[PDB]
Design a protein around this ligand. Structure first.
Ligand code: FAD
Ligand code: FAD
Ligand code: EOL
Ligand code: EOL
Ligand code: CA
Ligand code: CA
Lengths: 525, 524
């Protein structure tokens, strides 16, 4: 029947719902099954129901977020704060803890508070999407560009608060995060950095302020509800060129990664975040699985060759963008061609050179890499009927043999659980991300369970090989946090200890990143 | 005899022996003669302050655990340092008098790893910039380090006070990647991929999984750091350092305003731009008495003599470029066209000045190329028994803000009879007004003048909306008090976390104005 917060009666919840309505207004509290359906994980993981929200409250202001937090303390209601709630791949808007109330900050707190052309920064509310901020910069003939992930409909703030990434030189969103406002778990409000000094202009200029630097503690965290966040914005460069390098062989991965890293570690000639996508990923962006293979089980070699041939793509496809005066772009492109040119079968294409279906991903990278938000990459989910995805992203050293081992290890398990291997190898400066998107039929309970059991295996095996996940789904946060158990889980004990100090009543997103406040510890949900 | 607060002669003597049982008899100092060397070398205020009770030098992480556990038992406050060279901010001296200094760097001074492939170091606290430079030279490294002005500090300890250098990797804390820390009750923790047993990425990926804590251990008293990683930048094929002299006090406005556009895209100004006033560059190469032996502020005549003799401006801009010679030349050309629009602007590369005035340029050419130096110690010869205090408000990188800040500080410096040694430094979007006040450390009134002058500068800067990035023991309470948005919400947040991790209030009480429960309200 009715989803309730843990240890909270029908009466007590009805009372708390009304207190919420007194703060934000009747139409900004959802609690009917019909109203809540939209806030369930759109890509559900596992056959069983999980991650069930009891209600959605949409606050209009920081003060309203304080009031909601104080009520949640009164009634012991757990709050799952989101911005836009588009964390698709990691649970969407759905709370880790079933019965939690979703605080959708972004519905009404969606205002651009400042875009400074002189100093190159924005001060944003959670509700500001990449499309909102893009449209604002266009409107105002801005000299600035934003840094967006593959999908423009997410929150600049929300994405930053899960340490999301884009593909411009400003792709590490949390680095460029500068100052935030946060409602702490008992309702008091705090500004970090120069925000903490009344009348400073430097909130979005100097990240650290004075004393311990806390902003990090509010990312992949449950230590408060963020109401404002500053972010630095790069100046748009005078020109840019996007290029695709197709690599013919599965085994080329080793040489590609080993040539990638020297070209990237000095942020030149690879100026942007280098992404290497397998043919599955690029095929899924432009085609249905059944275009290639309507059989059961893993995709055969003949089918993969047909994908490569028809799309004129390799097994591994490298995407990069260069920025600056055309001479500098041409110099950097020349270096890139010489270095990756030593791999037999490497073929090169600029964004101007491919208008065919195989080229559509390059055209999308040319947008995303230039801070032009897109939703083209939603086409991935038409690979199979009713397509959803889960993100599996272990962090690796950027070595060719280390990539090769991860390639084998994950494709092998993928095959066993009848899921295709959609994978990208991405490099920051000195780290490698194995970005695996498993696409499955969300309507099929067996496919959902296969995904939950497969990724549980993939997490454990990756950790046995010394690979930690940078980010994970609601279903895997306990399993993943368990892997960071150096010194008898010293890290988790440190986090719990702080969680209990700031959230004595255990209100804020209990179980986020495997961090449960005292009142829930040992209870298996 | 200096004792910890609320600890008897007999309890302390017991505790000193327990320390000896852990680290050895030789590695516990507690005589007045032994402790002299660990007093603030640039003392602030007339009165005695910042008195250590003992110095304990541990050999290992395990020993640090044992010391912290003993400290918890006896309620002894511990001030963890690396090398203890935080000169201008108290040196090795503890904020709280009676604290035991834990000099981690004395014996924990080992380079644990330098990775040529991935460009990083994993370091203990005692590794100095000289130590790590020597290592890189020895091993024919492709890598360069990022050092502050003085090479004798700790790579780790400087990072833990969010210190800065002048290469593209000038933000030390940014490039910090992984640490190991002994938390205030003696348990040991590794951050990031350090927390995943057998990961290779401790020094490759900073964040790891869940909340990002590393920042909480910088300008902090939440533990004793025993290892720290840091990224090292590949040495580029060539570099060129350059000096722009600017003739006029009033040029500051246009310098800062041309400086920001050339810096924010990290090109053409590829390194940290530093603008030094003639006082700064003169004190680097000469004594005060060479220019003016009279009492009180230095007259216009004397300033003009400094400029002529050293062939420098009132404001001197020092930068470095890196890469292929064609790139360096292109960038230098853009810099010359931009700053050239200021009348009286003159340009010199490091190759074009072998005179005394050029000595600072030569020292920057070293520092900006990750070659540690001690040349800038000559600043302390400006007056007899020279010491300095660091006063560094953070500002918008705006000409008129720089100009306001220049007047505001020089006026108060004048009033308290201290010379105005100042640099304007710029990261990407922020500006540091770095003011070194050089004074006679043997003169109790010069000491009191410094304390009272900087107290005034701190609240006057705060009234103008400027916060300090970093400050001295004597000012930490005053400085933290200025960050009082939402009724001092930030300090309240820091205090709850301090009390959660340090229930006995052991680790560096009062660091950054953060006192644990047992000390709050006691005025030391
Ligand atoms: C399916 C998919 C997903 C995807 C992607 C490609 C595909 C095909 N590419 C991505 C990429 O390139 N980079 C990236 O970082 N993510 C990518 N994803 C995943 C996802 O689409 C995006 O990351 C998305 O932008 C994230 O969702 P959103 O931006 O809406 O953020 P949120 O869901 O509202 O909040 C995220 C989490 O952070 C915490 N949170 C959020 N807001 C707050 C506030 N105000 N206070 C406290 N905590 C907050 C919550 O834990 C929330 O779940
Ligand atoms: C006088 C002076 C000072 C100076 C400078 C120029 C002059 C003329 N130029 C500097 C510069 O360009 N950049 C910079 O960051 N600092 C500069 N200074 C100040 C100072 O000399 C240096 O910053 C110096 O590197 C700091 O000294 P050191 O490196 O020895 O650091 P420390 O005293 O040992 O530690 C600093 C503080 O951090 C905490 N700490 C240190 N180690 C630990 C450990 N292991 N665990 C926990 N906390 C630790 C303490 O609070 C300590 O006081
Ligand atoms: C090809 C990149 C897609 C992608 C990148 C980073 C992510 O975190 C992600 O989450 C599911 C998806
Ligand atoms: C002339 C630059 C010296 C300098 C720079 C940054 C600092 O923090 C500092 O501390 C006292 C001194
Ligand atoms: Ca072939
Ligand atoms: Ca032992």
């Amino acid at each position: 029947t009715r989803t309730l917060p843990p240890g909270v009666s029908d009466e007590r919840f009805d009372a708390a719902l009304q207190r919420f309505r007194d703060v934000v207004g009747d139409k900004w509290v959802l609690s009917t099954a019909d109203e809540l359906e939209a806030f369930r994980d759109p890509y559900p993981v596992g056959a069983a129901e999980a991650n069930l929200p009891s209600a959605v409250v949409s606050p209009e202001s920081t003060e309203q977020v304080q009031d909601i937090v104080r009520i949640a303390n009164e009634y012991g209601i757990p709050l799952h704060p989101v911005s836009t709630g588009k964390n698709n791949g990691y649970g969407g808007a759905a709370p880790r803890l079933s019965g939690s109330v979703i605080v959708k900050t972004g519905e009404r707190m969606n205002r651009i508070l400042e875009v400074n052309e002189k100093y190159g920064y924005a001060l944003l509310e959670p509700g500001v999407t990449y499309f909102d901020l893009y449209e604002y910069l266009q409107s105002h003939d801005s000299g600035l560009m934003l840094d967006c992930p593959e999908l423009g409909w997410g929150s600049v703030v929300g994405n930053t608060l899960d340490r999301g990434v884009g593909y411009t030189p400003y792709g590490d969103h949390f680095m460029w995060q500068t100052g935030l406002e946060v409602v702490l778990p008992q309702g008091e409000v705090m500004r970090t950095g120069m925000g903490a000094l009344p009348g400073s202009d430097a909130w979005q200029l100097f990240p650290y302020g004075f004393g311990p630097f806390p902003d990090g503690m509010f990312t992949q965290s449950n230590l408060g509800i963020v109401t404002k966040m500053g972010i630095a914005l790069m100046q748009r460069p005078p020109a840019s060129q996007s290029f695709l390098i197709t690599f013919d062989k599965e085994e080329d991965l080793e040489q590609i990664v080993d040539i990638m890293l020297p070209l990237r570690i000095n942020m030149a000639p690879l100026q942007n975040v280098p992404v290497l996508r397998n043919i599955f990923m690029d095929a899924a962006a432009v085609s249905k699985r059944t275009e290639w293979f309507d059989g059961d089980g893993p995709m055969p070699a003949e089918a993969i060759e047909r994908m490569k041939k028809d799309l004129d793509l390799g097994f591994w496809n490298f995407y990069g963008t260069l920025y600056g005066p055309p001479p500098l772009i041409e110099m950097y492109y020349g270096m890139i061609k010489e270095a990756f040119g030593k791999i037999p079968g490497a073929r090169f294409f600029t964004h101007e050179e491919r208008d065919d279906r195989g080229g559509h991903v390059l055209q999308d990278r040319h947008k995303i890499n230039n801070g032009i938000p897109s939703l083209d990459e939603l086409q991935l989910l038409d690979w199979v009927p009713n397509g959803g995805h889960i993100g599996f992203v272990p962090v690796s050293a950027p070595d060719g043999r280390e990539a090769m081992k991860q390639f084998e290890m994950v494709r092998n398990r993928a095959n066993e659980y009848n899921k295709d291997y959609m994978a990208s190898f991405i490099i920051g400066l000195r780290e490698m991300y194995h970005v695996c998107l498993f696409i499955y039929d969300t309507a099929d309970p067996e496919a959902r369970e296969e995904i939950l059991q497969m990724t549980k295996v993939l997490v454990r095996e990756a950790a046995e090989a010394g690979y930690g996940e940078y980010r994970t789904h609601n279903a895997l946060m306990d399993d993943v946090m368990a892997t960071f158990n150096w010194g008898d889980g010293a890290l988790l004990k440190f986090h719990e200890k702080i969680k209990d100090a700031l959230d004595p009543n255990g209100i804020i997103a209990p179980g986020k990143s495997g961090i449960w406040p005292q009142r829930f510890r040992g209870q298996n949900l």
